Each structure stands twice: as C-alpha cells, then as structure tokens.
Amino acid sequence: VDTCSLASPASVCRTKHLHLRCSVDFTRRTLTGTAALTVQSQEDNLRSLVLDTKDLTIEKVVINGQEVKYALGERQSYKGSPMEISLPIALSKNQEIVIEISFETSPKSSALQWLTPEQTSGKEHPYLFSQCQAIHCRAILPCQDTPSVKLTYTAEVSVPKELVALMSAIRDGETPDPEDPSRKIYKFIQKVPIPCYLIALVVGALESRQIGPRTLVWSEKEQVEKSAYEFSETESMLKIAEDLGGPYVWGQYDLLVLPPSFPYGGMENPCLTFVTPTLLAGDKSLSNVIAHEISHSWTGNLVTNKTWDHFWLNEGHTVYLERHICGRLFGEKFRHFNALGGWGELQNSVKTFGETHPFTKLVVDLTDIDPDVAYSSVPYEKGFALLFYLEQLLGGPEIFLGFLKAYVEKFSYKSITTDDWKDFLYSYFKDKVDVLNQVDWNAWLYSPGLPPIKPNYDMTLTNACIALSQRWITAKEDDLNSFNATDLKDLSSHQLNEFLAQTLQRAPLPLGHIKRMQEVYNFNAINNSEIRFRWLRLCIQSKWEDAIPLALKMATEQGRMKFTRPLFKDLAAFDKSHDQAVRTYQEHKASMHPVTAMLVGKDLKVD
C-alpha cells in the first residue's frame, strides 16, 4: 500500500497510458486541458476508481463519448483531495477503458513555478517549470500518484508561439495551434513505462546546443555557452554508466539548465535531466551531479521504489553508481574521498535531526508525513553507506557491481520494496549467505542514528584537508600569522570544499580566525556554489557581520534548497541577522518556489 496516495492501488486498477492535451496560460498561470487515462482493471466487476488530485478544478469526466459521475472528497492536507469516478459499465479483470478528464490547475499548484519575465535571464518572456517528485504530479493532473504504477505517455502542449515547450519524452514534432495562431503545439512521446513523478514540463525562451552524440543542453540563450562547457563530460559519463548498469534504454540524454530557483541540484526526468544553474562553476568541478542524474536512468527510472518509504533504493543505489563513474574518471582514491565525505554529510544530518529521530531511519514510514518535510541526505548517504559496507563485506567493487548490474536487469520496468531488494541480494550471493547473515539488518534498515558499522575508507586525499582544518581549530592568535595562501597550493576545489566541511563541523570558530581566513585565502572571491555555501555558513555561525549581506544574497539569488534552507536557518539563529532573515523571506516568499517557500517558512517558524 502507498500511504502517500489517495488513489486506488495497483491491485485494484493500473494506468497504462496518459494522453495529455493541454494549453499553458501565462495570463492566468493555469494549465488547462484533458488528461485521457487508459486504465486496466485488476479486479472483477470494477465499478469505481479513485484518483489523486491537489488543487485541480475538474470540468467534466467522459467515458465512451458521455459524461459520467465523479466526486471530490475532502482535502487531506498535502495529499490533496481524492477523486472518485463512477464507471458507466462494470469492468472485468484486465479490461481496459479510456477515461478523459477535463481539468485546470491552480496558480498555487505545488508542482509548478511560474516566473515573470524579470525573473528570467532574457527579461522578455515568462517561464514555467514542473517538479513532480515525490507527490506533486496530482497538482498538475488527476492520476494514481504513486511510483507503484508505471505508464507510457504522449502529450500535446500549446504555448505562446515565441516560447518552447519541452517534456521528459522524445520530441515528436511542432505545428501552429489551429485554435489560436498566437500559439504552437509541441508534441511528445514517452514509449518507456515510467512512474508519474517522472512526468516533466518546461516552457520558456529556450535554445539548445549539442554536446555529445545523444545530448543537447537547453537553457535561456545567455546560459548556453557556459552550460555546454560545464557538462562536456556527459557522453563519457554515459558510456561508463552503460558499462555498469547495462544499456541506456531512453534514446536521448538531454540536459536542461533551469533558472536559479530550481529547488534541487538535479531531477532525473527521463530524456531530459533538469539541473540547477549553481552547477555552473566554470571548471566542471560539480559534475558528480550529472553522474548522479545519469545513474538514475537505471536506479530509480528502470527499477523504482514502490512507495516513498523505500526512497533509499532510488537514492543510495544512484549515489553508489555515481561514485563509481567518478572513480572511473578520476581514480579509486577519489571514489573513497567522496564516499568518506558522504559519511560526513550523514554525521551532519544525524546530528541536526538527533540520533533517535525517525527521519534518520533508512526506511521510514511516511503515512502522515509530507515527503518534502522528511527529505534529506539520509536516504542518499545511509543508503550509500549500506552498499559500500556490503561491497567490502562481499568481495570488493567488481563483485558488487556484478550484483548491481544483475539487480537492474532483474527489476527493470518494475517497482520494488526493501524486501524485494534484500531477497534478491540473498539469491545473488547464495554462496555468501553466512556473510550476509552477519549484517545487522534491523539496525541498518529500521534503526535511527548513524549505522552500526562504518565502512573502511582510503584517507589519501582527505588527510591534507583534515590536517589544515585541525591547524585552524587548534590555532591561537599568535599562530594566525603563519597561515598563508600557499596552504591551498596543492588542494583541488574538492579538497578546499572538504577543508571547509571539516572546519564547519567544529563551528563556531573565533571571529579573528575567520577574518584571518578571508585575509589569507580570499574565500569571498570564490564563486563555486558548494565552497561559497560552506564558507558563508562558517562565517555566519562564527558571527561575522560582514558576511550577513553575502549570505542573504546567496539565499535569495538562487533557490537550491540544499543552500537556501541552511543559509536562512543560519541567518535566523544569528541574533544580528535574525530580523532581516525573517523580513527577506517575507518579501521574497510570493515569488519563491512553492515548496521551498513552505519549507523555509517552517524552518524560520514564520507564518
């Protein structure tokens, strides 16, 4: 059972296909049109079914040429309102019908962000983007809003002729709109069955440049050149992902670089990965996020978590694969560097939540929890830590990668639970079931806090970061003169980032140490978003007032929640910046991404 969904379960009926015809109305900030659902009954004598909606206005429902009865139940908070449809003729098991729902979204759709022209790069045209994961697809169209159901889809999207629509699908043509010469209809086909959270739409003033044999980058004109360079490694990452996971089944691997309020670093929308523009560091240093998104083309998009309680299946497997691609490209010691850094991110998250907090369990029961509220690094990093532990336990990377490849072949086009995965792990490693029985399964999967066992990590690239950080923490005033620009001489951006992650773990530092750090390292000049983020955090937490406007500016000039949430929270806990933080949030709130707005508001304990 999917406790985040109010729709009929897959055991009652299944959506096989969606045909979406819609029009994007920037004047009303609505999307209007029809969702035609091809539904297969899984039950005998089926007379009604229930769908997910959230702030949709239903016009009518039509089956076999005629309108039918439907009722909207009461809203259940973030789950929205269930829509019961009365079927005109009872269905037999495996019978299929098409149900056509005429609907319109609200301007307040939690799946959508509408941007004015001044919120974009070109300043001439508005922009729309979606973000359905986890349970916002219902806020766009009526559906069984559960990753336990996979469907194909086709879509026809009408938009102002001077704009471009793109979706998570192969582009299937464009023509003028017959019903309105000021408009174009773009057509789309997704031939691979996907959970509905993978449904994606963007409409904006978009251009494209080709960067590999099966990759275009898309963005507003003024981002194209930079994006083309930043992601040039994409094809070669793809080939390595294909070697590890098996064939890329989706045809195209395009990239869309979004405006800065996109809430995530990336979203693995099939055929068209959405990325944050905070990735555009100038040096390709943040390309693990492409590897991450690429890896989802197997782990998540091919084998899918059955409910959001099993989200670690998606995330931990993708992080595991992400780190193998980066290890191939840049060496096994880099894989261990990033693995150990992820363990540190896990320490931070368990420390922030508290070591007995339910959101620190690998598998969580999301029954009355908004997935957006529960979201964090835990499923990523505790997930990854589990697989890195099993890897070392069961014979090393080459052996565990054979399991990952087999696990993907086994569960392609399906949705699975943690037990499905563990049963399969036991089948695959039949000859190592004694070794498997040494694992504390209950603790790893179901207990809060840090895992019961820590993997073994090569420290080679980490040591210089730890050494430098310890110099700064143990320094007294008479030691600050000895710090120098040359200290950073032999550190990559990655190591500079880890240096700051380490120091931030012991924050606050004395204010004089942080002022000195800016004197000798000029971290204020670094535009790498990861580095700048943790530097500004270290500053605000060490109570440097000069950093207030720098932190406020980063918090609001981009909306990647990874950065935006902890910057506002740090700004709010700093007494000197508190009132300004709360005030800046209130000013920007109405033009923020609706989910980021919600979560920052809760973080600040405002409204």
Which residues participate in the annotated binding site for a peptide?
Answer: 131-133, 263-268, 560-562
Other beta carbons within 10 angstroms of residue 182's beta carbon come to 10
**Shortest distance in whole angstroms from residue 478 CB to Yb ion:** 4
CB of 264 to ligand STL, least distance (A): 7
Q: Between 197 and 403, whose beta carbon lies closer to ligand STL? A: 197
**β-bridge pairing 215-220 and 254-257:** parallel
Here the tokens at position 428 are 């695959």
Enumerate residues 6+ apart whose C-beta is below 8 A from 562.
264, 265, 533
* Rounded Cα distance, 215 and 208, in Å: 10
Region binding Yb ion by CB under 5 A among candidate stretches 38-46, 354-362, 373-381, 478-486: 478-486
Smallest gap from Cβ 296 to Zn ion, in A, equals 6
- Nearer Cβ to ligand STL, position 306 or 336? 306
Distance CA 486, CA 473 (A): 18
Q: Which stretch binds Yb ion (CB under 5 A): 40-48, 446-454, 472-480, 499-507?
A: 472-480
Q: Which residues contact 147 (CB under 8 A, 6 or more apart)?
A: 2, 134, 195, 196, 197, 304, 305, 306, 307, 308, 415
The Cα–Cα gap between 386 and 454 comes to 9
Nearer to Zn ion, 145 or 315 (CB): 315
Peptide bond into 508 cis (omega under 30): yes
Sequence-distant (≥ 6) Cβ neighbours of residue 607 within 8 angstroms: 601
- Min dist CB 408 to Zn ion, Å, is 15
- Would you state the structure tokens that stand for residue 603, as one six-digit string? 């973080």
Sheet holding 70-72, edge to edge: 46-53, 81-91, 70-72
Q: How many residues form the binding site for Zn ion (CB under 5 A)?
A: 2
Among 589, 568, 596, CA closest to 131: 596
Residues within the annotated binding site for Zn(2+)?
292, 296, 315
Q: Which does 478 bind (CB under 5 to 8 A by kind): Yb ion, ligand STL, Zn ion, none?
A: Yb ion
Interface pick for Yb ion out of 478, 486, 490, 575 (rule CB under 5 A): 478
DSSP 501-546: HHHHTTPPPPHHHHHHHHHHH-GGG---HHHHHHHHHHHHHTT-GG
Task: List the structure tokens of 389.
Answer: 């532990």
CB nearer to Yb ion: pick between 367 and 474 = 474
Q: For this structure, is 197 an active site residue?
A: no
The size of the interface with Yb ion (CB under 5 A), counted in residues, is: 2
Q: Which of 230, 293, 322, 530 is catalytic?
A: 293
Which tokens is 203 given? Answer: 């409409």
Sheet containing 170-177, strands listed edge to edge, beginning at the edge strand earlier in sequence: 66-67, 56-63, 96-105, 30-41, 13-25, 150-160, 180-195, 170-177
What binding mask, one character per residue, do residues 43-72 give for Yb ion by CB under 5 A, x or -? ------------------------------
Residue closer to ligand STL (CB basis): 312 or 483: 312
Residues engaged in binding ligand STL (CB under 6 A)? 133-134, 308-309, 311, 359, 364, 371-372, 374-376, 378-379
Tokens 């997935």 sit on residue: 371
Find the shortest distance in angstroms from Cβ 267 to Zn ion. Answer: 8
Cα 187 from Cα 174, distance rounded (Å): 6
Partner whose binding site includes residue 420, from Zn ion, ligand STL, Yb ion, none (CB under 5 to 8 Å by kind) = none
384 binds, among Yb ion, Zn ion, ligand STL, none (CB under 5 to 8 A by kind): none
By beta-carbon proximity to ligand STL, the closer residue of 126 and 195 is: 195
User: CB-wise, 315 or 381, nearer to Zn ion?
Assistant: 315
Show the site string, 266-285: x = touches Zn ion by CB under 5 A, - = not. --------------------
Hey, what amino acid is at 68? V
Contacts of residue 590, Cβ cutoff 8 Å, sequence gap at least 6: none
Site residues for Zn ion, 282-321, by CB under 5 A, read 315, 318
Q: How far is the CB of 342 from ligand STL (least distance, A)?
A: 15
Of 431-460, binders to Yb ion (CB under 5 A) are: none
Catalytic residue among 186, 320, 380, 457: 380
Q: Quick one: what does residue 544 bind among ligand STL, Yb ion, Zn ion, none, with the CB cut-off 5 to 8 Å set by partner type?
A: none
* Cβ count within 10 A of residue 34: 18
Annotated binding site: 131-133, 263-268, 292, 296, 315, 560-562
Residue 472 Cβ, how far from Yb ion at the closest point, in Å? 14
74 part of the interface to Yb ion, by CB under 5 A: no
Q: Which residues pair with 183 in a beta bridge?
A: 160
The stretch near Yb ion (CB under 5 A) out of 17-25, 263-271, 473-481, 519-527 is 473-481
Residues taking part in catalysis: 293, 380
Which residues bind to Zn ion, rule: CB under 5 A?
Answer: 315, 318
Which residues bind to Yb ion, rule: CB under 5 A?
Answer: 476, 478
